[PDB]
């Protein structure tokens, strides 16, 4: 049971003097917060709002030097409850018309302090993105989607996001099987947009949907074509 | 009294954030279920919404106390404050633990570390319900769940024998469909993130067709029938026989429309589908046999209800 | 300067006392002495099988630890102090979101007495499930419950007894009644036990008996039929040397017949059984069908004595079978 | 009110022999239906409660049955100190008793 | 234990009241609501009412509308019976029973013999 004390005190010295208000390396380089994301699935195509509903693993490691611990061969796990103790990124995604993390058993939610210092933030998200539909091709439409990671607050000089793996960041996506769509390719861009106020991160997975003409030649142009 | 300060001993100095015998062995779970109600099933959305009592059990060597009490029965009061397995369900759209009166949890704790935590919850979980030969379509839907964070090394996820306790089916609201029998399962799972065990339990649920048939099958086949009605109509009567044959189409589309209601978007050559398809183009071979005839009717008569025959065969036979 | 002595004791009241014990642990049951009076019956979700209805959910037991001597023997409490003391956990049996109302403040009160008889009421939308066999449809009456008992405690930790005659616990409003097709014939009650498999736990059924209301169906669906009925009858009395008229009065019964069809399946949700729609509809399509094919028959059979024969018979038919129907299901319990 | 009527009016039977004693209520009463047995100048004991539970202290050969409106108490052997008036009290509502049958050797 | 002491047996003539009363120590007096019970000769229980002793609220049967006066001493822990404009038809005896839940009626008192004559 020494491990388990161990482990009780490293984790207390690392969550006492703890400043959630400063971002890792305050006053220095930006905090590289690599970004991971999985979709689970996509729920639905909502062409009538222009919206998607999409459930995906999204995950984003970074490191803070302070959660820093070398006794322990081991990466700690600690509970959901402790994310609301440390820092996080600000992000937000800039095309989203409501969105929740899932709650049940308990709040989905994920820590892991690994022992150099990244932590590993995941949280299980549910996602009703905007996407503008030009539907003027329709049912014979290639609707672009897009998700617009980005940061709030924080300009390129405080943090920078990017995908760890140059395309493995996204996971998942060939599995998913759309009712009325077939996700022909996705593509994953990390642009620095320039704002009024200064230059801030963005991250713009995009998934290129088409319109499964199969399913609507019999819905709808058969009968009329009949007629 | 002596159960409060049995408690207050066990609260302090506990750390809600550590697992049990975190780097020392995995914490072994057994999980038993309650299915108390599996809602309606979904079809537009392939998603089925289930009421269960989802009761975890773990041993805890911090929540040991020696005493008369061989058990500490409590509320939820005390649930937040142990540490809980962060259990979800791999595949839950959306799910809420009841919280009217008061949050609906138990938690039970020995002497020996055995604890009961169990709560309820209504999770309208995600099944994969394909459409090829509809209706007929058997489904295991499962219920995948398995710690958020934890790896493998850290949480281990173990059926008992007496796991999964379905309850009187009888009043269900299962219908379109009939609970066969339950199945359960663990493998590891590989992520990202890292390895995981996903315990998946199988519901199989066998098609209720009788609604469908009464519903759609037999008024459709009825307006087949119907077009037999008008070959049957004899001499030229170039009226009543156009009259007899357009009509019928309006009718079959109206059908057709109606058996779209609860067909999801999925891009599948469904076998409903098929059936009002095949009778349109009946209905429409029989208005162009009197279209050709007005410019041989004894044999497209005989023929047709064998087609019709042969149709209901092979669809049988799916 | 009376508020004093209010607020000293009201905050001596709660020290030392632990709110995850229940009242008298280790030393005797806890008796709550339930009671509800049912604000308004909210609308059987006859297509979800449930029912919504709205309660004042009155509760009482003893505490020995809330005991206090004062000037007032009945100490109203704010919904603050009311989480800070034991209450039972009260949940439903089969409830499926249930929703307390917030609006303004909390909808609970909280009294206790000079002895310590504590009084819980809350206000309460709880939307049970009511399983329904739609098999007498629209006939059919269901004796929808209310199970309710504690989650966390057994038989043997909180016993649950209605606090008056068990006959008058559960009051219904007068004006309460929010049903659209149904009426509130009456109410009865019981206090079981159920054999979980954690262990055992004491249930208190109510059992609301509801009378579907057939006034609106009898109009929208079954009158309609009827009338179609008779309007695929009417065809056998056109002459049959005019095959058009025939022909199209016939296709259009059937047309008919699926609108009203269409229309009747929206009403009612999913059945597989020989409801009520399902029975008179299928012998009404029948009926009109056969019309078809007895109009088919005498076109050709070339009035003669087989078309008087077949219009004639039909309708003794079709009495008969509403006479059966309605007689059955009228009598049917 | 809810009338009670013990349609056994005076059963008569030899000790070691199973008798049922009937107790039909007018209208629902649940399964609040409890048994008392009186013997001869002295107050009414309780034996059994609820429909089918057996009051402590109660000699296992009594046991009792009943749903909705019929309940039976039965004897499985009858001694010699089971010959007293046995009375049916319901209580879903207002209390009202039953009329009491008797029982002999 | 339990034990519900009743007034000893009575005689009076009739048209004037009487007053009979019933103790319990066993068990605290305001718990339980004390049912006052009639049973003439050879004939069946016949509830009068009952009275919670804690607040005094007391219902009567509708037979015994203004025939019986239930009143109460929680200092006494007594239950008191006051009878008024006695006939003939009130000869029988009269036990006092405690309700301990919705089910059965516990304890009994020994029974009160009142004769009218
Ligand atoms: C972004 O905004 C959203 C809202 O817009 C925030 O989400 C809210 O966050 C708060 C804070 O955590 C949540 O409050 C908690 O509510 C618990 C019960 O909630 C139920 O009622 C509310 C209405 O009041 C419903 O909306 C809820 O349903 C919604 O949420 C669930 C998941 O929770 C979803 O699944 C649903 O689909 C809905 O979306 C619920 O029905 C309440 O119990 C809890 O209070 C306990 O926990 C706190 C934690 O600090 C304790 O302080 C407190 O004392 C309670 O602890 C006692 O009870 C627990 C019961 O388990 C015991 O375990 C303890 O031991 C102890 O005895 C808390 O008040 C709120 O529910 C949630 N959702 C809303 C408002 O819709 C996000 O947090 C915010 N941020 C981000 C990043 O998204
Ligand atoms: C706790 O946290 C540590 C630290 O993050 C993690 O340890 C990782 O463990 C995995 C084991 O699967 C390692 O994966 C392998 O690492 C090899 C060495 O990596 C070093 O060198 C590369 C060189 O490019 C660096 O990029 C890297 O950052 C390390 O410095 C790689 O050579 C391996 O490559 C291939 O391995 C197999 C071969 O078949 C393939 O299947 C793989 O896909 C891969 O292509 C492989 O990547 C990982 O490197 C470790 N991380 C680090 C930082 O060293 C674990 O999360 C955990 N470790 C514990 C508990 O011991
Ligand atoms: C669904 O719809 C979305 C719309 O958002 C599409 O997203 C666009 O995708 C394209 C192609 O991937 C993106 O174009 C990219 O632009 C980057 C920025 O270009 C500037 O680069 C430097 C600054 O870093 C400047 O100095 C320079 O002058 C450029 O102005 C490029 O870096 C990207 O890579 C390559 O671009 C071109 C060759 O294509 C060359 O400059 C280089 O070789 C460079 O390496 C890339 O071109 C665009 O930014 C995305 N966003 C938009 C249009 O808003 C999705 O592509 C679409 N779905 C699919 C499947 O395509
Ligand atoms: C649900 O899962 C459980 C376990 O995951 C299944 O029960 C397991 O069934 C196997 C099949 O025989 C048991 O194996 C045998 O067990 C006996 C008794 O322990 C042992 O003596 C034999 O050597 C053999 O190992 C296994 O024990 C049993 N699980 C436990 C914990 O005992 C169960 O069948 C699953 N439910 C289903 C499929 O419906
Ligand atoms: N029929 C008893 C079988 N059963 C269980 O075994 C699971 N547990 C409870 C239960 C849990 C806590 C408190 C009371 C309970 F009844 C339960 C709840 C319902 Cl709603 C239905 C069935 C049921
Ligand atoms: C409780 O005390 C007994 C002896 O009284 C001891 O054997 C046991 O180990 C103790 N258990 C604890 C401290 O959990």
Same mark, same amino acid.
């Not at chain 1, 091709?137 to 990017?162: A, V």
């Not at chain 2, 609970?179 to 998946?200: A, I, P, Q």
């Not at chain 5, 005689?11 to 068990?27: D, E, R, W």
């Given at each position: 049971?020494?491990?388990?004390?161990?482990?009780?005190?490293?984790?207390?010295?690392? @969550?006492?003097?703890?400043?959630?208000?400063?971002?890792?390396?305050?006053?220095?380089?930006?905090?590289?917060?690599?970004?991971?994301?999985?979709?689970?699935?996509?729920?639905?195509?909502?062409?009538?709002?222009?919206?998607?509903?999409?459930?995906?693993?999204?995950?984003?490691?970074?490191?803070?030097?302070?959660?820093?611990?070398?006794?322990?061969? @081991?990466?700690?796990?600690?509970? /959901?409850?402790?994310?609301?103790?440390?820092?996080?990124?600000?992000?937000?995604?800039? /095309?989203?018309?409501?969105?929740?993390?899932?709650?049940?058993?308990?709040?989905?939610?994920?820590?892991?302090?690994?022992?150099?210092?990244?932590?590993?933030?995941?949280?299980?998200?549910?996602?009703?993105?905007?996407?503008?539909?030009?539907?003027?091709?329709?049912?014979?439409?290639?609707?672009?989607?897009?998700?617009?990671?980005?940061?709030?607050?924080?300009?390129?000089?405080?943090?920078?996001?990017?995908?760890?793996?140059?395309?493995?960041?996204?996971?998942?996506?060939?599995?998913?099987?759309?009712?009325?769509?077939?996700?022909?390719?996705?593509?994953?861009?990390?642009?620095?947009?320039?704002?009024?106020?200064?230059?801030?991160?963005?991250?713009?997975?995009?998934?290129?949907?088409?319109?499964?003409?199969?399913?609507?030649?019999?819905?709808?142009?058969?009968?009329?074509?009949?007629? | 009294?002596?159960?409060?300060?049995?408690?207050?001993?066990?609260?302090?100095?506990?750390?809600?954030?550590?697992?049990?015998?975190?780097?020392?062995?995995?914490?072994?779970?057994?999980?038993?279920?309650?299915?108390?109600?599996?809602?309606?099933?979904?079809?537009?959305?392939?998603?089925?919404?289930?009421?269960?009592?989802?009761?975890?059990?773990?041993?805890?060597?911090?929540?040991?106390?020696?005493?008369?009490?061989?058990?500490?029965?409590?509320?939820?009061?005390?649930?937040?404050?142990?540490?809980?397995?962060?259990?979800?369900?791999?595949?839950?759209?959306?799910?809420?633990?009841?919280?009217?009166?008061?949050?609906?949890?138990?938690?039970?704790?020995?002497?020996?570390?055995?604890?009961?935590?169990?709560?309820?919850?209504?999770?309208?979980?995600?099944?994969?319900?394909?459409?090829?030969?509809?209706?007929?379509?058997?489904?295991?839907?499962?219920?995948?769940?398995?710690?958020?964070?934890?790896?493998?090394?850290?949480?281990?996820?173990?059926?008992?024998?007496?796991?999964?306790?379905?309850?009187?089916?009888?009043?269900?609201?299962?219908?379109?469909?009939?609970?066969?029998?339950?199945?359960?399962?663990?493998?590891?799972?590989?992520?990202?993130?890292?390895?995981?065990?996903?315990?998946?339990?199988?519901?199989?649920?066998?098609?209720?067709?009788?609604?469908?048939?009464?519903?759609?099958?037999?008024?459709?086949?009825?307006?087949?029938?119907?077009?037999?009605?008008?070959?049957?109509?004899?001499?030229?009567?170039?009226?009543?026989?156009?009259?007899?044959?357009?009509?019928?189409?309006?009718?079959?589309?109206?059908?057709?429309?109606?058996?779209?209601?609860?067909?999801?978007?999925?891009?599948?050559?469904?076998?409903?589908?098929?059936?009002?398809?095949?009778?349109?183009?009946?209905?429409?071979?029989?208005?162009?046999?009197?279209?050709?005839?007005?410019?041989?009717?004894?044999?497209?008569?005989?023929?047709?209800?064998?087609?019709?025959?042969?149709?209901?065969?092979?669809?049988?036979?799916? | 300067?009376?508020?004093?002595?209010?607020?000293?004791?009201?905050?001596?009241?709660?020290? $030392?006392?632990?709110?995850?014990?229940?009242?008298?642990?280790?030393?005797?049951?806890?008796?709550?002495?339930?009671?509800?009076?049912?604000?308004?019956?909210?609308?059987?979700?006859?297509?979800?099988?449930?029912?919504?209805?709205?309660?004042?959910?009155?509760?009482?037991?003893?505490?020995?630890?809330?005991?206090?001597?004062?000037?007032?023997?009945?100490?109203?409490?704010?919904?603050?102090?009311?989480?800070?003391?034991?209450?039972?956990?009260?949940?439903?049996?089969?409830?499926?979101?249930?929703?307390?109302?917030?609006?303004?403040?909390?909808?609970?009160?909280?009294?206790?007495?000079?002895?310590?008889?504590?009084?819980?009421?809350?206000?309460?939308?709880?939307?049970?499930?009511?399983?329904?066999?739609?098999?007498?449809?629209?006939?059919?009456?269901?004796?929808?419950?209310?199970?309710?008992?504690?989650?966390?405690?057994?038989?043997?930790?909180?016993?649950?007894?209605?606090?008056?005659?068990?006959?008058?616990?559960?009051?219904?409003?007068?004006?309460?009644?929010?049903?659209?097709?149904?009426?509130?014939?009456?109410?009865?009650?019981?206090?079981?036990?159920?054999?979980?498999?954690?262990?055992?736990?004491?249930?208190?059924?109510?059992?609301?008996?509801?009378?579907?209301?057939? $006034?609106?169906?009898?109009?929208?669906?079954?009158?309609?039929?009827?009338?179609?009925?008779?309007?695929?009858?009417?065809?056998?009395?056109?002459?049959?040397?005019?095959?058009?008229?025939?022909?199209?009065? $016939?296709?259009?019964?059937?047309?008919?017949?699926?609108?009203?069809?269409?229309?009747?399946?929206?009403?009612?949700?999913?059945?597989?059984?020989?409801?009520?729609?399902?029975?008179?509809?299928?012998?009404?399509?029948?009926?009109?069908?056969?019309?078809?094919?007895?109009?088919?028959?005498?076109?050709?059979?070339?009035?003669?004595?087989?078309?008087?024969?077949?219009?004639?018979?039909?309708?003794?038919?079709?009495?008969?079978?509403?006479?059966?129907?309605?007689?059955?299901?009228?009598?049917?319990? | 009110?809810?009338?009670?009527?013990?349609?056994?009016?005076?059963?008569?039977?030899? =000790?070691?022999?199973?008798?049922? =004693?009937?107790?039909?209520?007018?209208?629902?009463?649940?399964?609040?239906?409890?048994?008392?047995?009186?013997?001869?100048?002295?107050?009414?004991?309780?034996?059994?409660?609820?429909?089918?539970?057996?009051?402590?202290?109660?000699?296992?050969?009594?046991?009792?049955?009943?749903?909705?409106?019929?309940?039976? =108490?039965?004897?499985?052997?009858?001694?010699?100190?089971? =010959?007293?008036?046995?009375?049916?009290?319901?209580?879903?509502?207002?209390?009202?008793?039953?009329?009491?049958?008797?029982?002999?050797? | 234990?339990?034990?519900?002491?009743?007034?000893?047996?009575?005689?009076?003539?009739?048209?004037?009241?009487?007053?009979?009363?019933?103790?319990?120590?066993?068990?605290?007096?305001?718990?339980?609501?004390?049912?006052?019970?009639?049973?003439?000769?050879?004939?069946?229980?016949?509830?009068?009412?009952?009275?919670?002793?804690?607040?005094?609220?007391?219902?009567?049967?509708?037979?015994?509308?203004?025939?019986?006066?239930?009143?109460?001493?929680?200092?006494?822990?007594?239950?008191?019976?006051?009878?008024?404009?006695?006939?003939?038809?009130?000869?029988?005896?009269?036990?006092?029973?405690?309700?301990?839940?919705?089910?059965?009626?516990?304890?009994?008192?020994?029974?009160?013999?009142?004769?009218?004559?």
């Amino acid at each position: 049971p020494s491990n388990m004390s161990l482990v009780k005190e490293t984790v207390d010295r690392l @969550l006492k003097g703890y400043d959630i208000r400063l971002r890792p390396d305050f006053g220095g380089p930006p905090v590289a917060v690599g970004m991971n994301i999985d979709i689970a699935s996509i729920d639905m195509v909502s062409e009538v709002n222009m919206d998607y509903t999409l459930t995906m693993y999204f995950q984003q490691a970074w490191r803070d030097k302070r959660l820093s611990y070398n006794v322990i061969p @081991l990466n700690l796990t600690l509970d /959901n409850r402790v994310a609301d103790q440390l820092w996080v990124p600000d992000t937000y995604f800039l /095309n989203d018309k409501k969105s929740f993390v899932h709650g049940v058993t308990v709040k989905n939610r994920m820590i892991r302090l690994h022992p150099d210092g990244t932590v590993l933030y995941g949280l299980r998200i549910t996602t009703t993105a905007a996407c503008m539909m030009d539907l003027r091709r329709y049912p014979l439409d290639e609707q672009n989607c897009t998700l617009e990671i980005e940061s709030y607050g924080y300009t390129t000089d405080d943090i920078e996001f990017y995908w760890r793996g140059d395309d493995n960041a996204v996971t998942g996506v060939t599995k998913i099987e759309l009712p009325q769509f077939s996700i022909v390719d996705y593509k994953l861009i990390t642009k620095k947009v320039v704002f009024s106020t200064g230059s801030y991160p963005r991250l713009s997975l995009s998934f290129k949907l088409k319109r499964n003409i199969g399913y609507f030649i019999l819905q709808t142009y058969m009968p009329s074509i009949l007629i | 009294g002596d159960v409060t300060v049995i408690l207050n001993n066990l609260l302090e100095g506990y750390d809600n954030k550590l697992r049990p015998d975190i780097g020392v062995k995995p914490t072994l779970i057994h999980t038993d279920m309650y299915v108390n109600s599996i809602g309606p099933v979904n079809a537009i959305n392939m998603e089925y919404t289930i009421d269960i009592f989802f009761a975890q059990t773990w041993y805890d060597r911090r929540l040991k106390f020696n005493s008369t009490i061989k058990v500490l029965r409590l509320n939820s009061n005390m649930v937040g404050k142990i540490w809980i397995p962060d259990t979800f369900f791999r595949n839950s759209k959306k799910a809420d633990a009841h919280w009217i009166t008061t949050p609906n949890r138990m938690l039970r704790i020995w002497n020996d570390g055995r604890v009961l935590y169990t709560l309820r919850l209504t999770i309208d979980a995600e099944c994969q319900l394909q459409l090829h030969n509809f209706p007929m379509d058997e489904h295991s839907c499962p219920l995948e769940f398995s710690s958020y964070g934890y790896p493998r090394e850290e949480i281990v996820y173990q059926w008992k024998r007496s796991s999964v306790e379905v309850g009187d089916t009888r009043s269900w609201r299962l219908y379109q469909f009939s609970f066969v029998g339950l199945r359960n399962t663990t493998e590891v799972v590989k992520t990202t993130s890292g390895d995981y065990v996903v315990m998946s339990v199988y519901f199989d649920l066998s098609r209720r067709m009788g609604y469908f048939t009464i519903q759609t099958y037999i008024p459709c086949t009825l307006i087949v029938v119907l077009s037999w009605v008008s070959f049957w109509i004899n001499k030229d009567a170039v009226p009543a026989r156009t009259s007899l044959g357009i009509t019928t189409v309006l009718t079959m589309t109206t059908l057709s429309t109606i058996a779209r209601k609860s067909l999801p978007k999925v891009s599948y050559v469904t076998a409903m589908d098929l059936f009002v398809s095949v009778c349109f183009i009946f209905v429409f071979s029989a208005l162009v046999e009197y279209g050709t005839l007005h410019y041989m009717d004894s044999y497209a008569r005989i023929f047709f209800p064998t087609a019709f025959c042969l149709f209901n065969l092979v669809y049988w036979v799916s | 300067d009376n508020t004093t002595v209010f607020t000293r004791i009201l905050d001596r009241l709660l020290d $030392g006392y632990d709110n995850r014990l229940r009242p008298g642990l280790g030393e005797r049951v806890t008796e709550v002495k339930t009671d509800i009076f049912v604000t308004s019956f909210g609308p059987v979700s006859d297509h979800d099988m449930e029912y919504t209805i709205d309660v004042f959910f009155r509760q009482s037991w003893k505490d020995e630890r809330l005991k206090f001597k004062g000037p007032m023997t009945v100490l109203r409490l704010n919904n603050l102090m009311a989480s800070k003391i034991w209450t039972p956990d009260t949940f439903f049996h089969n409830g499926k979101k249930s929703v307390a109302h917030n609006m303004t403040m909390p909808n609970k009160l909280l009294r206790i007495t000079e002895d310590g008889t504590l009084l819980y009421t809350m206000r309460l939308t709880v939307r049970a499930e009511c399983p329904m066999h739609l098999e007498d449809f629209p006939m059919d009456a269901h004796a929808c419950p209310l199970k309710f008992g504690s989650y966390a405690y057994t038989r043997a930790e909180v016993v649950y007894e209605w606090t008056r005659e068990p006959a008058r616990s559960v009051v219904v409003a007068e004006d309460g009644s929010r049903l659209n097709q149904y009426d509130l014939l009456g109410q009865t009650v019981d206090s079981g036990i159920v054999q979980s498999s954690t262990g055992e736990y004491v249930v208190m059924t109510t059992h609301f008996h509801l009378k579907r209301k057939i $006034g609106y169906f009898v109009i929208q669906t079954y009158l309609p039929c009827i009338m179609t009925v008779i309007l695929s009858q009417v065809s056998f009395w056109l002459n049959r040397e005019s095959v058009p008229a025939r022909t199209v009065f $016939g296709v259009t019964t059937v047309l008919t017949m699926t609108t009203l069809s269409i229309s009747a399946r929206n009403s009612l949700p999913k059945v597989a059984y020989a409801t009520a729609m399902d029975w008179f509809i299928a012998v009404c399509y029948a009926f009109v069908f056969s019309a078809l094919i007895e109009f088919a028959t005498v076109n050709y059979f070339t009035v003669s004595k087989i078309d008087r024969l077949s219009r004639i018979a039909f309708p003794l038919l079709f009495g008969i079978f509403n006479l059966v129907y309605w007689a059955t299901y009228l009598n049917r319990e | 009110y809810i009338v009670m009527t013990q349609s056994p009016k005076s059963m008569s039977m030899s =000790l070691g022999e199973r008798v049922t =004693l009937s107790c039909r209520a007018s209208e629902y009463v649940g399964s609040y239906v409890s048994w008392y047995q009186q013997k001869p100048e002295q107050s009414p004991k309780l034996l059994i409660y609820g429909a089918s539970n057996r009051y402590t202290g109660v000699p296992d050969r009594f046991a009792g049955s009943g749903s909705a409106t019929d309940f039976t =108490l039965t004897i499985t052997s009858v001694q010699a100190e089971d =010959l007293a008036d046995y009375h049916c009290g319901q209580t879903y509502n207002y209390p009202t008793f039953g009329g009491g049958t008797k029982l002999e050797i | 234990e339990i034990q519900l002491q009743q007034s000893g047996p009575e005689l009076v003539k009739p048209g004037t009241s009487v007053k009979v009363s019933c103790k319990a120590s066993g068990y605290s007096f305001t718990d339980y609501n004390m049912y006052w019970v009639k049973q003439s000769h050879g004939k069946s229980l016949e509830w009068i009412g009952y009275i919670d002793p804690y607040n005094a609220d007391t219902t009567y049967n509708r037979e015994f509308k203004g025939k019986a006066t239930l009143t109460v001493d929680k200092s006494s822990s007594t239950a008191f019976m006051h009878l008024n404009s006695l006939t003939s038809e009130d000869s029988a005896v009269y036990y006092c029973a405690r309700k301990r839940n919705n089910f059965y009626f516990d304890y009994w008192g020994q029974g009160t013999p009142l004769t009218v004559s």
